[PDB]
Amino acid sequence: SKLPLLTENGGRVNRVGFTRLSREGSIHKFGFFYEFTQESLDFDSDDQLK
Amino acid sequence: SKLPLLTENGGRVNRVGFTRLSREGSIHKFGFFYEFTQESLDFDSDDQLK
């Protein structure tokens, strides 16, 4: 039914078109932090804590 | 009951016939096209649109 047949005299028959979509992707910013008092690294059992 | 048999005394006792058939095929025409406008080619974001 949709085969693009062409007759002998031709003319404006079987005109086609095209489309062009687009993509996207964004960059996001992350981060986290901890805190520690000097008298916690010092004055503690584990020398290798930090 | 149909094997051809020939006596030594001459022939004209076995005549055969032949037949031939015909096969056919046909051609067809196809086509399609698209329009476009200069601007669409020299103002569009992509350079290689054509």
Structure determination technique employed: cryo-EM
CA dist B26 and A45 (Å) reads 96
Which tokens sit at A34? 């901890």
C-alpha of A28 from chain center = 10
Instruction: Give B41's contacts in chain A (Cβ within 8 Å).
Output: none
Q: How far apart are CA B48 and CA B50, in angstroms?
A: 6
Tokens of B13: 């006792």
Residues of A engaging B, defined by a Cβ cutoff of 8 Å: 3-8, 10, 13-18, 20
Q: Please, what's the b/e burial string for A14-23 (b: 16 or more CB within 10 A of its CB; e: otherwise)?
A: beeeeeeeee
Whole-angstrom Cα distance, residue A37 to residue B14? 123
Resolution of the PDB structure in angstroms: 3.6
Closest by alpha carbon to B27, among A46, A26, A5, A27?
A5
Mutate to test the interface with A, among B27, B33, B45, B47 (most CBs of A within 10 A): B33
